[PDB]
Amino acid sequence: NCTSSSATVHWLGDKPTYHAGVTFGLPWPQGKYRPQETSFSLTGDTLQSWATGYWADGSLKWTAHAIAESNQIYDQYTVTASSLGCVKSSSSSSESSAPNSSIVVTDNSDALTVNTGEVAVSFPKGGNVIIGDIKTKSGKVIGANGRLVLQSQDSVPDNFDNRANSPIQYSNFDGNINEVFVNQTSARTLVTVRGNHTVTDGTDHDPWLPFVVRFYLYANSATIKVMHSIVFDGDENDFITGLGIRFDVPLKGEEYYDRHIRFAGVDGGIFNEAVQGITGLRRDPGEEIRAAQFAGQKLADTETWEPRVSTRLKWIPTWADYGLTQLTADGFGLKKRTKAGQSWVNIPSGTRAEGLAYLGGATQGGLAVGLRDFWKRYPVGLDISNAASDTGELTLWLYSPAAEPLDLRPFHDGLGQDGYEDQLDALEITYEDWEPGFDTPYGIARTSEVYLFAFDQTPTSDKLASLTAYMNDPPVLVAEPKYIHETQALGEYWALPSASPAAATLEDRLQFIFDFYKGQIEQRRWYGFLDYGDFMHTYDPDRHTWRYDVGGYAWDNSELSPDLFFWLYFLRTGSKDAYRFAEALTRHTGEVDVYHIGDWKGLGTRHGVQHWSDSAKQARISQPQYRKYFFYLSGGDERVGELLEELLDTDKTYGELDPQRKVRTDGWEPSPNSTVSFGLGTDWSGLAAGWLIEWERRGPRWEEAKTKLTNTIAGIANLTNGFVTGSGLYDPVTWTLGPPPSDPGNRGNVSISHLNAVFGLPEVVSEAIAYLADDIPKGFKQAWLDYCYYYHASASEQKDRYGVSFSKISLLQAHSRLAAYAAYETKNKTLALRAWKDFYASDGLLPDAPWNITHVDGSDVLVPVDEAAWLATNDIAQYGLAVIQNLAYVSDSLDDYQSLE
């Protein structure tokens, strides 16, 4: 019979003044709603839907929803779910109403056309043009031949002087379409276009730099959201110099004085000009003619002016090109010229441009284009070309050619390092684990969030400033935290913020950590095309800088799961700032810090001076768990969907590359057609998170992932030392897990690492135990409980059980949460107290650490900066997770712990 329930959803911060349609996710409790048998309705104070994840029983876990662009914006949106037996025992009569707007698509051998009711855009199925043309509802074309432009060069001169004696061969490229896909729905439609960049001008060069561009169009919207994603293919010789998206804007028929150029400036500023300026001449055509051009309206017929002006328009210059370059994160330049062959006139410019340009006119219409977080991702640009011609160009440079070309080559030569002993010895001084030919960016990726806007006529500047604001803070709808928690669709291991004054200062200290790391991004200028979203790993208290030049201490690359902390922090709080911080991080770490092709497809690169410089290529960085939260909140963002699917191939890498090669003291080395060795902590937490997720989404490979997950859970269980076992051997035909090389026949092996639990293990393990339910392999849960308990048992408790004590245990604050979990699962108050003692005593960040920032200025530093010095990113990340998880599992013990002193 009938089952129905509601969940509410809220704007991430303040209520928007404009949105362009929006997708959101909603969790649902285990077993409540069958797929295909569940309708969903929208209440806005007074619904397009689909599934993104499922429970082990097959019921709905997460769904995504989509609402059209709308004048009417509410403070909150309430979805109601209804089982199908809810309307198949009804005897009432609903009106079936038509939506006021609804998407339609036409299909053809040549092209694919999506009509929202405000625009219609065509997507060629082949060739060197992504978007064929863009029409308003009028029918008129406002822009056309959207194409991807790449430019490269085959070498770099040693320095500026070397230019005269070092030839650079420049080469241009076009986006070649290979595949076009579609997700049609009435409320929004997603066109996914995969491709390749191919030569146009300059030297013949294999096609390269694969792409996939996603176009989101919503009913009733003239706004297209564009998720441009490129994987890097090149080698020592392919230096990128220009990367961008370009449109023709047809202006023929428009008087020059009716053609309009707008660039977004600083803080909701807009730059307002026309191709032929009528304002500030020696003579005046009339107050209202001038006001009108400034406003972007069609100017009165020539006959009504003062004739002093109309007769001499042949002598007023005519500005064909405009250029805006943002080459540092703190200043941009702006210039125009009359045409090629003449010098540019410099325009008064400023600090940080919000990254939108418009080209068009009062009659012919036109389009605006922009990049989200424009200046934060320098070097970038905005070009207008040939605006005094029949067809204008409008270009967004994701990488400005006015910048130095993008050099991805190694930052050093090896410093003489010959083989592992030397490499390991460098590790001891710089924390860098170098290896020859491993400092490579081959396979890394980056996504960019572009927006397109179509106009029937030049819009007001206020509209342009609004769309600019919009683009840079795209409205998000999210589930209430309390509801996400009750559903348990996203972990047992966190809960909301208790009366303990101890607990209250913990919350303050998580806020402190967050406020600090948010501010540092600005202060240390962790900005730029590849860099933005990451932060650094450790500080230099002498120089007052993050150790950007000392091997492993530089870019943090998700070391010790800061990604879990900041996402868990967002879940618990619903803070806008927190989501944005984690959004940015997840777009960096998932794209730039992991390999998407090549022999290492599915491994990421350990923390280093470059995001790819270190040899340790491991699954703990690619760690799918770090993406799960943002995948599901957000309505199954299809890019991350793809990234998660890519990771299913990670097990294949342990045949090509063993992460322990340099330290493994057994015989082992991978060989062909043969069981492969990986870790049970670091490596297996990566593998399992990915398998769990494929199973959850019921994607192409879900059975397989279910098998690999369940068999390895059984293999660890059957290993007589469980996780404490060093870490075993995996068969890539049978999908099973045996004991390691140093112990065939499972007699008992012991290898402990402070790193095994801190890259997702407890989080994946808890979800896996929860998902598998009654089908869980016998005594796997005991083995996990074992690891959790013996890790900071006494040395004699360890020797008793496993044969030897664990001398090299550290990160005791970090592992406090493993006791906390065990304390909850066994209902043991003493084990609970141990979690808190390890949290508050032991290591990491102690409660009596400074817990403040120092300001540093004058001649000590380049710029004024705030600093810790007493903390490092490893510290805060595990602290943060310790606070959250110990509070989830054992808050009932915290005042008890506190009252004993």
Residues in contact with its own copies, total (CB under 8 A)? 131
Least distance between its own copies and beta carbon 422 (Å)? 8
Pattern 578-597, Ca ion, x by CB under 5 A:
---------------x----
* 465-504 binders of its own copies (CB under 8 A): 465
Q: Out of 254, 321, 593, 838, name the contact with its own copies by CB under 8 A.
A: 321
Q: Out of 461, 653, 677, 718, name the contact with its own copies by CB under 8 A.
A: 461
Least distance between its own copies and beta carbon 378 (Å)? 9
Strand 38-43's sheet: what is its strand order? 38-43, 76-83, 4-11, 477-479
Name the residue nearer to Ca ion (CB basis): 611 or 708: 611
Here the tokens at position 618 are 């491991």
Least distance between its own copies and beta carbon 489 (Å)? 40
* 595-624 binders of Ca ion (CB under 5 A): 611
Give the count of beta carbons closer than 10 Å to the beta carbon of residue 733.
Answer: 7
Positive or negative: CA dihedral 159, 163, 167, 172: positive
* 175-214 binders of its own copies (CB under 8 A): 201-203
Q: Which does 170 bind (CB under 5 to 8 A by kind): Ca ion, its own copies, none?
A: its own copies
* 293-312 binders of its own copies (CB under 8 A): 293-294, 308-309, 312
Q: Out of 410, 491, 604, 722, name the contact with its own copies by CB under 8 A.
A: 410
Name the residue nearer to Ca ion (CB basis): 221 or 613: 613
Name the residue nearer to Ca ion (CB basis): 378 or 555: 555
Q: Is 627 helix (H, G, I), strand (E, B) or coil?
A: helix
Residues in contact with Ca ion, total (CB under 5 A)? 5
Q: Which does 341 bind (CB under 5 to 8 A by kind): Ca ion, its own copies, none?
A: its own copies
Q: Out of 331, 497, 598, 777, name the contact with its own copies by CB under 8 A.
A: 331
Name the residue nearer to its own copies (CB basis): 158 or 303: 158
Q: Does residue number 76 form part of the binding site for its own copies (CB under 8 A)?
A: no
Q: Which does 416 bind (CB under 5 to 8 A by kind): its own copies, Ca ion, none?
A: its own copies
Q: Which stretch binds its own copies (CB under 8 A): 78-86, 458-466, 642-650, 667-675?
A: 458-466
Least distance between its own copies and beta carbon 175 (Å)? 14
Least distance between its own copies and beta carbon 472 (Å)? 14
Q: Which stretch binds its own copies (CB under 8 A): 4-12, 403-411, 628-636, 870-878?
A: 403-411
Q: Which does 611 bind (CB under 5 to 8 A by kind): Ca ion, its own copies, none?
A: Ca ion
Q: Which does 663 bind (CB under 5 to 8 A by kind): its own copies, Ca ion, none?
A: none
**Is-contact 414 439, C-beta < 8 A?**
no
Q: Is 438 helix (H, G, I), strand (E, B) or coil?
A: coil
Q: Out of 94, 97, 416, 665, name the contact with its own copies by CB under 8 A.
A: 416
Q: Does residue number 242 form part of the binding site for its own copies (CB under 8 A)?
A: yes
Measured between its terminal Cα atoms, the distance across the chain in Å is 56
* 538-557 binders of Ca ion (CB under 5 A): 555, 557
Give the count of beta carbons closer than 10 Å to the beta carbon of residue 800.
Answer: 12
Name the residue nearer to its own copies (CB basis): 82 or 276: 276
Pattern 142-161, its own copies, x by CB under 8 A:
-------x-x------xxxx
DSSP 374-405: TGGG-SEEEEEE-TTSSEEEEEEEEE-TTS--
Name the residue nearer to its own copies (CB basis): 548 or 668: 548
Q: Of 136, 462, 16, whose CA–CA distance to 269 is shortest? A: 462
Peptide-bond breaks in the chain following residues (C–N over 2.5 A): 46, 497
CA-to-CA separations, 317 to 139, 338, 349, 427, 886, in angstroms, rounded: 33, 7, 21, 63, 70
Name the residue nearer to its own copies (CB basis): 195 or 265: 265
Q: Of 138, 134, 141, 140, whose CA–CA distance to 217 is shortest? A: 134
**Is-contact 130 111, C-beta < 8 A?**
no
d(C-alpha 637, C-alpha 189), whole Å: 13
Residue type at 790?
Y
Q: Which stretch binds its own copies (CB under 8 A): 74-82, 315-323, 677-685, 813-821?
A: 315-323
Least distance between its own copies and beta carbon 345 (Å)? 5
Q: Which does 555 bind (CB under 5 to 8 A by kind): its own copies, Ca ion, none?
A: Ca ion
* 615-674 binders of its own copies (CB under 8 A): none
Cα 825 to chain centroid distance, Å, stands at 34
Side-chain-side CA neighbours of 263 within 13 Å: the count stands at: 28
Q: Out of 32, 194, 290, 754, name the contact with its own copies by CB under 8 A.
A: 290
Strand 729-731's sheet: what is its strand order? 676-677, 729-731, 736-738
d(C-alpha 67, C-alpha 82), whole Å: 18
Query: Which spans in 594-652 are helix H?
Result: 619-622, 625-632, 638-647
Give the count of beta carbons closer than 10 Å to the beta carbon of residue 855.
Answer: 8
Q: Does residue number 347 form part of the binding site for its own copies (CB under 8 A)?
A: yes
What H or E segment, with its residue span, contains residue 119?
A: strand 119-124
Q: Out of 105, 180, 426, 657, name the contact with its own copies by CB under 8 A.
A: 426
**Is-contact 116 219, C-beta < 8 A?**
yes
Q: Does residue number 545 form part of the binding site for its own copies (CB under 8 A)?
A: yes
* 244-283 binders of its own copies (CB under 8 A): 263, 265-273, 277, 279-283
Q: Does residue number 563 form part of the binding site for Ca ion (CB under 5 A)?
A: no
d(C-alpha 398, C-alpha 149), whole Å: 10
Name the residue nearer to Ca ion (CB basis): 293 or 557: 557
Least distance between Ca ion and beta carbon 564 (Å)? 16
* 673-732 binders of its own copies (CB under 8 A): none
Q: Give strand pairing partners of 582.
A: none
Contacts of 199 (CB under 8 A, 6+ apart): 171, 172, 173, 174, 205, 207
Least distance between its own copies and beta carbon 759 (Å)? 21
Q: Which does 48 bind (CB under 5 to 8 A by kind): Ca ion, its own copies, none?
A: none
Least distance between Ca ion and beta carbon 659 (Å)? 18
Q: Which does 593 bind (CB under 5 to 8 A by kind): its own copies, Ca ion, none?
A: Ca ion
d(C-alpha 570, C-alpha 633), whole Å: 11
* 510-539 binders of its own copies (CB under 8 A): 524-526, 528, 531, 538-539
Q: Which long-range contacts (CB under 8 A, 24 or more apart) does 828-832 make?
A: 829/893, 829/896, 831/789, 832/889, 832/890, 832/892, 832/893, 832/896
Backbone angles phi, psi at 528, to 5 degrees: 135, 155
**Is-contact 770 707, C-beta < 8 A?**
no
Give the count of beta carbons closer than 10 Å to the beta carbon of residue 719.
Answer: 24
Q: Which does 900 bind (CB under 5 to 8 A by kind): its own copies, Ca ion, none?
A: none
**Is-contact 455 222, C-beta < 8 A?**
yes
d(C-alpha 312, C-alpha 326), whole Å: 37
Name the residue nearer to its own copies (CB basis): 151 or 221: 151
Least distance between Ca ion and beta carbon 621 (Å)? 9
d(C-alpha 367, C-alpha 352), whole Å: 22
Q: Which does 534 bind (CB under 5 to 8 A by kind): its own copies, Ca ion, none?
A: Ca ion
Least distance between its own copies and beta carbon 278 (Å)? 9
Least distance between its own copies and beta carbon 831 (Å)? 35
Binding site for Ca ion (CB under 5 A): 534, 555, 557, 593, 611
